[PDB]
Design a protein around this ligand. Sequence first.
Ligand SMILES: Cc1cc(O)cc2c1[C@@H]1O[C@@](C)(Cc3cc4c(c(O)c31)C(=O)c1c(O)cc(O)cc1C4(C)C)O2
Length: 245
Amino acid sequence: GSHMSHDAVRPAPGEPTWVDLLTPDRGAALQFYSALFGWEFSTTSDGTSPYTMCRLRGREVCSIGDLGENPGPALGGWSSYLSVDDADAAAAAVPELGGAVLLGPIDILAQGRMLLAGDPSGHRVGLWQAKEHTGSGPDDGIGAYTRSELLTGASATDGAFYRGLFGADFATESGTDGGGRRAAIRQVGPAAPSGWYPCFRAQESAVPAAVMLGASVLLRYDCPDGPAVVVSAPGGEVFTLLLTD
Ligand SMILES: Cc1cc(O)cc2c1[C@@H]1O[C@@](C)(Cc3cc4c(c(O)c31)C(=O)c1c(O)cc(O)cc1C4(C)C)O2
Protein backbone atom coordinates (compact mmCIF):
# COMPACT_ATOMS: atom_id res chain seq x y z
CA GLY A 1 0.00 0.00 0.00
CA SER A 2 2.28 2.71 -1.42
CA HIS A 3 4.85 1.88 1.24
CA MET A 4 8.53 2.77 0.88
CA SER A 5 11.59 0.67 1.66
CA HIS A 6 13.83 1.25 4.66
CA ASP A 7 17.09 -0.10 3.23
CA ALA A 8 19.66 1.60 1.00
CA VAL A 9 21.56 -0.63 -1.44
CA ARG A 10 24.92 0.64 -2.70
CA PRO A 11 26.60 -1.71 -5.20
CA ALA A 12 30.29 -1.59 -6.11
CA PRO A 13 30.99 0.70 -9.07
CA GLY A 14 33.42 -0.33 -11.79
CA GLU A 15 32.13 -3.88 -12.21
CA PRO A 16 30.58 -4.33 -15.66
CA THR A 17 27.24 -6.07 -16.10
CA TRP A 18 27.52 -8.26 -19.21
CA VAL A 19 28.28 -8.04 -22.92
CA ASP A 20 26.80 -10.28 -25.61
CA LEU A 21 27.48 -10.29 -29.34
CA LEU A 22 25.20 -11.92 -31.90
CA THR A 23 26.57 -13.36 -35.11
CA PRO A 24 25.16 -14.94 -38.25
CA ASP A 25 27.43 -17.96 -37.86
CA ARG A 26 28.53 -18.74 -34.30
CA GLY A 27 30.90 -21.37 -35.63
CA ALA A 28 32.71 -18.78 -37.72
CA ALA A 29 32.53 -15.99 -35.18
CA LEU A 30 34.36 -18.10 -32.63
CA GLN A 31 37.21 -18.30 -35.15
CA PHE A 32 37.48 -14.53 -35.60
CA TYR A 33 36.46 -13.15 -32.21
CA SER A 34 38.40 -15.73 -30.26
CA ALA A 35 41.43 -15.11 -32.49
CA LEU A 36 41.58 -11.53 -31.18
CA PHE A 37 41.78 -12.34 -27.48
CA GLY A 38 42.92 -15.96 -27.77
CA TRP A 39 40.12 -17.61 -25.82
CA GLU A 40 38.94 -21.22 -25.82
CA PHE A 41 35.61 -22.79 -26.67
CA SER A 42 33.46 -25.00 -24.46
CA THR A 43 30.76 -27.60 -25.00
CA THR A 44 27.10 -26.68 -24.65
CA SER A 45 24.66 -28.38 -22.31
CA ASP A 46 22.34 -31.04 -23.71
CA GLY A 47 18.56 -30.77 -23.88
CA THR A 48 18.67 -27.01 -24.40
CA SER A 49 19.53 -24.76 -27.33
CA PRO A 50 23.18 -24.62 -28.40
CA TYR A 51 25.05 -22.23 -26.11
CA THR A 52 28.83 -21.80 -26.36
CA MET A 53 30.33 -20.34 -23.19
CA CYS A 54 33.79 -18.77 -23.76
CA ARG A 55 35.87 -19.33 -20.63
CA LEU A 56 39.56 -19.64 -19.78
CA ARG A 57 41.61 -20.56 -16.71
CA GLY A 58 38.33 -21.57 -15.07
CA ARG A 59 37.33 -17.89 -15.04
CA GLU A 60 34.15 -16.50 -16.59
CA VAL A 61 34.62 -14.01 -19.43
CA CYS A 62 31.79 -13.80 -21.95
CA SER A 63 29.25 -15.64 -24.07
CA ILE A 64 28.40 -15.64 -27.76
CA GLY A 65 24.93 -15.66 -29.25
CA ASP A 66 23.39 -16.39 -32.62
CA LEU A 67 20.27 -15.97 -34.69
CA GLY A 68 20.20 -18.81 -37.25
CA GLU A 69 16.92 -17.95 -38.95
CA ASN A 70 16.33 -14.61 -37.20
CA PRO A 71 17.18 -11.77 -39.61
CA GLY A 72 16.22 -9.12 -37.04
CA PRO A 73 17.89 -9.96 -33.72
CA ALA A 74 17.73 -7.94 -30.52
CA LEU A 75 21.44 -7.20 -30.08
CA GLY A 76 22.42 -5.80 -33.47
CA GLY A 77 26.12 -5.80 -32.59
CA TRP A 78 28.24 -5.10 -29.54
CA SER A 79 26.66 -2.96 -26.83
CA SER A 80 27.08 -1.94 -23.21
CA TYR A 81 24.65 -3.37 -20.65
CA LEU A 82 23.98 -0.90 -17.87
CA SER A 83 22.50 -2.17 -14.60
CA VAL A 84 19.22 -0.55 -13.60
CA ASP A 85 17.24 -0.58 -10.37
CA ASP A 86 14.73 -2.83 -12.10
CA ALA A 87 13.78 -3.76 -15.65
CA ASP A 88 10.53 -1.98 -15.03
CA ALA A 89 12.15 0.92 -13.19
CA ALA A 90 14.19 1.91 -16.21
CA ALA A 91 11.41 1.27 -18.70
CA ALA A 92 9.06 3.35 -16.53
CA ALA A 93 11.43 6.31 -16.53
CA VAL A 94 12.13 6.03 -20.25
CA PRO A 95 8.89 7.86 -21.10
CA GLU A 96 9.40 10.31 -18.22
CA LEU A 97 12.46 11.66 -20.02
CA GLY A 98 10.83 11.51 -23.44
CA GLY A 99 12.21 8.27 -24.83
CA ALA A 100 10.57 5.20 -26.33
CA VAL A 101 10.81 1.58 -25.19
CA LEU A 102 11.58 -0.79 -28.05
CA LEU A 103 11.88 -4.11 -26.23
CA GLY A 104 10.83 -5.50 -22.87
CA PRO A 105 9.85 -5.88 -20.23
CA ILE A 106 10.64 -9.55 -20.93
CA ASP A 107 11.46 -12.52 -18.71
CA ILE A 108 14.40 -14.46 -20.13
CA LEU A 109 13.96 -17.99 -18.76
CA ALA A 110 12.68 -16.38 -15.55
CA GLN A 111 16.35 -15.73 -14.79
CA GLY A 112 16.78 -12.13 -15.90
CA ARG A 113 15.32 -9.26 -17.88
CA MET A 114 16.85 -7.45 -20.87
CA LEU A 115 15.18 -4.50 -22.60
CA LEU A 116 16.17 -1.74 -25.00
CA ALA A 117 15.18 1.94 -25.07
CA GLY A 118 16.00 5.19 -26.85
CA ASP A 119 14.65 6.51 -30.13
CA PRO A 120 12.80 4.58 -32.84
CA SER A 121 15.71 5.10 -35.25
CA GLY A 122 16.84 1.73 -33.91
CA HIS A 123 19.03 2.70 -30.97
CA ARG A 124 19.56 -0.24 -28.63
CA VAL A 125 20.73 0.40 -25.07
CA GLY A 126 21.62 -2.68 -23.05
CA LEU A 127 19.61 -2.70 -19.81
CA TRP A 128 19.90 -5.53 -17.26
CA GLN A 129 18.11 -5.87 -13.93
CA ALA A 130 20.56 -6.35 -11.06
CA LYS A 131 18.91 -8.48 -8.37
CA GLU A 132 21.57 -10.99 -7.25
CA HIS A 133 24.82 -9.55 -8.61
CA THR A 134 25.93 -6.64 -10.77
CA GLY A 135 28.19 -8.74 -13.00
CA SER A 136 30.94 -9.14 -10.40
CA GLY A 137 33.06 -11.73 -12.17
CA PRO A 138 36.66 -12.85 -11.78
CA ASP A 139 39.25 -10.08 -11.96
CA ASP A 140 41.92 -11.75 -14.08
CA GLY A 141 42.99 -8.39 -15.49
CA ILE A 142 43.42 -9.18 -19.17
CA GLY A 143 40.72 -11.19 -20.90
CA ALA A 144 37.99 -9.77 -18.70
CA TYR A 145 35.70 -6.85 -19.47
CA THR A 146 37.13 -3.38 -18.85
CA ARG A 147 34.27 -0.89 -18.81
CA SER A 148 31.34 0.49 -20.79
CA GLU A 149 31.64 3.47 -23.12
CA LEU A 150 29.15 4.72 -25.70
CA LEU A 151 30.09 7.06 -28.53
CA THR A 152 27.13 9.23 -29.47
CA GLY A 153 26.72 12.47 -31.35
CA ALA A 154 24.72 13.96 -28.48
CA SER A 155 26.50 13.59 -25.13
CA ALA A 156 24.07 16.08 -23.57
CA THR A 157 21.09 14.00 -24.73
CA ASP A 158 22.40 10.57 -23.82
CA GLY A 159 23.50 11.93 -20.46
CA ALA A 160 19.90 12.97 -19.80
CA PHE A 161 18.78 9.43 -20.59
CA TYR A 162 21.29 7.93 -18.17
CA ARG A 163 20.72 10.43 -15.40
CA GLY A 164 17.01 9.65 -15.71
CA LEU A 165 17.07 5.86 -15.74
CA PHE A 166 20.04 5.53 -13.39
CA GLY A 167 20.78 8.94 -11.95
CA ALA A 168 18.90 10.22 -8.92
CA ASP A 169 16.43 11.90 -11.27
CA PHE A 170 14.90 8.45 -11.63
CA ALA A 171 13.33 8.71 -8.18
CA THR A 172 13.75 12.48 -7.91
CA GLU A 173 15.20 11.95 -4.44
CA SER A 174 18.35 11.15 -2.49
CA GLY A 175 19.12 8.89 0.47
CA THR A 176 18.19 5.42 -0.78
CA ASP A 177 21.32 4.91 -2.89
CA GLY A 178 25.02 5.61 -3.04
CA GLY A 179 25.86 5.92 -6.73
CA GLY A 180 27.41 2.62 -7.81
CA ARG A 181 26.20 2.70 -11.42
CA ARG A 182 28.58 2.32 -14.36
CA ALA A 183 28.33 4.14 -17.71
CA ALA A 184 30.24 6.53 -19.95
CA ILE A 185 29.23 8.71 -22.90
CA ARG A 186 31.49 10.74 -25.17
CA GLN A 187 30.64 13.24 -27.93
CA VAL A 188 32.39 12.39 -31.20
CA GLY A 189 31.64 11.63 -34.85
CA PRO A 190 34.07 13.12 -37.36
CA ALA A 191 37.21 12.05 -35.51
CA ALA A 192 35.83 8.87 -33.92
CA PRO A 193 33.21 6.18 -34.48
CA SER A 194 29.69 6.04 -33.06
CA GLY A 195 27.74 3.30 -31.33
CA TRP A 196 27.59 1.19 -28.18
CA TYR A 197 30.74 -0.85 -27.61
CA PRO A 198 32.48 -1.49 -24.31
CA CYS A 199 36.23 -1.64 -23.92
CA PHE A 200 38.29 -4.75 -23.24
CA ARG A 201 41.81 -5.46 -21.94
CA ALA A 202 44.45 -7.28 -23.99
CA GLN A 203 48.19 -7.39 -24.56
CA GLU A 204 49.82 -5.27 -27.26
CA SER A 205 50.12 -8.45 -29.35
CA ALA A 206 46.32 -8.53 -29.58
CA VAL A 207 46.34 -5.38 -31.72
CA PRO A 208 47.83 -7.13 -34.75
CA ALA A 209 45.94 -10.31 -33.89
CA ALA A 210 42.88 -8.54 -35.29
CA VAL A 211 44.68 -6.90 -38.20
CA MET A 212 45.95 -10.20 -39.57
CA LEU A 213 42.34 -11.39 -39.84
CA GLY A 214 41.41 -8.34 -41.92
CA ALA A 215 39.80 -6.11 -39.31
CA SER A 216 38.79 -2.62 -40.39
CA VAL A 217 40.62 0.41 -38.97
CA LEU A 218 38.48 3.34 -37.84
CA LEU A 219 40.16 5.02 -34.86
CA ARG A 220 43.04 3.95 -32.62
CA TYR A 221 43.94 7.00 -30.56
CA ASP A 222 42.50 9.96 -28.63
CA CYS A 223 41.50 8.15 -25.46
CA PRO A 224 41.66 9.08 -21.77
CA ASP A 225 43.81 6.04 -21.04
CA GLY A 226 46.16 6.75 -23.96
CA PRO A 227 46.66 3.83 -26.37
CA ALA A 228 43.37 2.72 -27.92
CA VAL A 229 42.39 0.47 -30.81
CA VAL A 230 38.92 0.40 -32.36
CA VAL A 231 38.40 -2.11 -35.14
CA SER A 232 35.27 -2.93 -37.10
CA ALA A 233 34.66 -6.63 -37.62
CA PRO A 234 33.62 -7.77 -41.11
CA GLY A 235 30.11 -8.63 -39.98
CA GLY A 236 29.51 -5.18 -38.52
CA GLU A 237 30.59 -5.67 -34.91
CA VAL A 238 32.45 -2.64 -33.49
CA PHE A 239 34.61 -2.91 -30.37
CA THR A 240 37.53 -1.25 -28.61
CA LEU A 241 40.76 -2.74 -27.31
CA LEU A 242 42.89 -1.19 -24.58
CA LEU A 243 46.44 -2.31 -23.84
CA THR A 244 47.05 -2.74 -20.11
CA ASP A 245 48.72 -5.15 -17.68
C1 LIG B 1 16.84 -10.88 -25.47
C2 LIG B 1 16.36 -12.17 -26.06
C3 LIG B 1 15.00 -12.41 -26.10
C4 LIG B 1 14.48 -13.60 -26.63
O1 LIG B 1 13.15 -13.84 -26.65
C5 LIG B 1 15.35 -14.55 -27.13
C6 LIG B 1 16.72 -14.31 -27.10
C7 LIG B 1 17.25 -13.13 -26.56
C8 LIG B 1 18.75 -12.93 -26.62
O2 LIG B 1 19.31 -13.83 -27.59
C9 LIG B 1 18.90 -15.15 -27.35
C10 LIG B 1 19.65 -16.06 -28.33
C11 LIG B 1 19.11 -15.60 -25.87
C12 LIG B 1 19.68 -14.53 -24.99
C13 LIG B 1 20.41 -14.86 -23.86
C14 LIG B 1 20.92 -13.88 -23.01
C15 LIG B 1 20.70 -12.53 -23.31
C16 LIG B 1 20.01 -12.19 -24.50
O3 LIG B 1 19.86 -10.91 -24.88
C17 LIG B 1 19.46 -13.20 -25.31
C18 LIG B 1 21.13 -11.46 -22.41
O4 LIG B 1 20.78 -10.28 -22.60
C19 LIG B 1 21.91 -11.84 -21.23
C20 LIG B 1 22.43 -10.84 -20.37
O5 LIG B 1 22.23 -9.53 -20.65
C21 LIG B 1 23.11 -11.19 -19.21
C22 LIG B 1 23.32 -12.52 -18.90
O6 LIG B 1 23.95 -12.93 -17.78
C23 LIG B 1 22.88 -13.50 -19.78
C24 LIG B 1 22.17 -13.19 -20.92
C25 LIG B 1 21.68 -14.33 -21.78
C26 LIG B 1 20.76 -15.22 -20.93
C27 LIG B 1 22.91 -15.13 -22.25
O7 LIG B 1 17.52 -15.27 -27.66
